Symmetry: C3
Subunit: 259 residues, 3 copies
């Protein structure tokens, strides 16, 4: 029993990993308002389901996602978490984008806020909003400034042109570029590594990484993580299992998080 | 009818693009207080002139700009927007630096806050202030921390040594390195791409990119762009021309912005 | 007469440069609570000693530092400046890390906040905390987000795996990768370049670089540096020696800073 998503597939590479496959490549994997809402409900489930540790989003064919359904938008409030629940997500658990092709407009605004990004060599990225008389207002602009630097975010967003996977790796957004055949396996390998770690440790690490984008100073972010999360982490059954496993020189057996 | 700049040339690669050429290479394109003020007035004109969409700054000979005239400084308040109106500029429209040679001291502080940076292979960058008993206080230090990262900004600013175009591209400031023959054409190509987009879209994108450097959190920056600019963008004649062009499957005909 | 550090060596490559050598490679250069406190007192001395301009930290054997002594931690408040006084240091004078091998857990949290980082080709970096049921809470997470970008900080911190020197150079933390034979000489060369500059200029530059990590906006950081430090820098005997040396066309003779 899992939520379903119209025009998409929901599957489980392992019992601890959720995969969303965007499955309307015939429409360049553009996302309707109804699909967007159903994807937001899947992430609500994911975040709340204690046994799920990591999620992946990917596309099909030559498209990752070309953004919102423009036929529908032509016939529209901009809020958090935004299109498919990603551009302005503040996640409790990490989501990996596996970008297999065109990643344009709202689709690129989705990826700019994913936790880890891997891309096939054929993937391309762009914000063509400026060419059509609108703008990328889903939340990517300040995020791209902080990942790519101002001048690279400016070249992408002001020009509206398409840029390669290799360019977005040199510029800081894409963690790894791999051959298309290896894309999903690479995302699953990274997800599997994360899924083997303590679920409490992964929750607290996500909080610490978020504070880096939320607070004016690195010291306020440092104090906040200790003050809000350190006692709770050390109180958990998982931390005590970690210490029993060290002292006993054996592998730790983790339980799902309540944090 | 355009403003003039002593020791510089003002020209128009297209009717929508302004080029400033620093034209005192015999003095390493150092900028006097009077020249600095005249360049600030040219950018005031540029920002206010609705038909101008993008600007470029470049030098001549083997110098882009070696900073302030040191003979004059030896015989001096530090404020926004600073030397030649660039180090602490908060621009409505983008300025591209085309760095053709020595980019030192105040000249590097200018470039650190330009929107896009392209450089010839022979260009070099440095902040020699620390070698002379002063410091780079025109506004580059926090900006370089945010583009290069702390440790690379530290190596440049603490050492006062010169670094290559190729180094400043690997480190994030320079968008592209090209052969000297191709430098101006490359800047003009990028400017032309931006100049073809909706002038309203480019204004709103500039605002969104700025908020990335102005607000503590990416969410405050995301909310601010929607709250301040989204209604105004969708009210504009340009947005309606964008939608008529989509529905009619033809090229949009843009008008200058009032935003 | 200098402070001593148990399990470490304190030496002076030049009269203006302090070197700390972590000297317990037999325990992977893990740092006990008592050693951590003694290193904090050495940096207090360093910061206060007017004749010392730059410091270096390095390890021995195949280890830079594998973090806290885990035998001792198993038998623990997290505050600034943290392990060996580095993860949450706000330094008056720069510290260079020369990473010669394993740089793990607290050892990586140390390096993430050093001013300049050089590494040998064999060096490796990781935060294995998540694999043991704890988390990297010494202050590195928000700092790594700001140096590497969110998605690269996420891959390192969420996975807990080891990453090469070459990877951490491509990603922005490591200034230079060199052969192991050349590591200390490379750190000393950079320190020597900084040590030749005005000690007042280096103090003010450090402040300006810090404000980049401390204030919400680049303009607040720009104003703060001018308002707090510009008058003091121009009042100093070193600034006047800089101007006498320019006018007289000779080399400046610097004095230690009181700033």
């Amino acid at each position: 029993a899992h939520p379903t998503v119209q025009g998409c597939l929901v599957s489980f590479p392992t019992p601890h990993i959720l995969l969303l496959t965007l499955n309307r490549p015939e429409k360049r994997n553009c996302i309707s308002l109804a699909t967007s809402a159903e994807i937001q409900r899947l992430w609500t489930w994911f975040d709340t389901q204690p046994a799920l540790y990591v999620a992946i989003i990917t596309g099909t064919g030559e498209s990752f996602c070309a953004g919102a359904d423009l036929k529908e938008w032509n016939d529209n409030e901009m809020t958090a978490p935004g299109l498919a629940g990603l551009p302005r997500r503040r996640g409790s658990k990490p989501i990996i984008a596996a970008v297999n092709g065109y990643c344009l407009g709202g689709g690129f605004e989705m990826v700019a806020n994913c936790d880890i990004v891997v891309a096939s060599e054929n993937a391309t990225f762009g914000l063509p909003e400026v060419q059509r008389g609108i703008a990328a207002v889903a939340g990517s602009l300040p995020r791209l400034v902080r990942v790519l630097g101002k001048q690279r975010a400016a070249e992408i967003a002001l020009s509206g042109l398409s840029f390669s996977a290799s360019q977005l790796e040199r510029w800081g957004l894409v963690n790894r570029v791999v051959e298309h055949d290896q894309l999903l396996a690479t995302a699953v390998e990274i997800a599997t590594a994360i899924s083997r770690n303590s679920p409490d440790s992964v929750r607290v690490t996500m909080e610490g990484l978020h504070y880096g984008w939320e607070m004016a100073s690195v010291e306020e972010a440092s104090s906040a993580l200790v003050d809000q999360w350190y006692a709770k982490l050390m109180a958990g059954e998982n931390f005590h299992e970690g210490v029993r496993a060290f002292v006993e020189k054996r592998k730790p057996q983790w339980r799902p998080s309540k944090l």
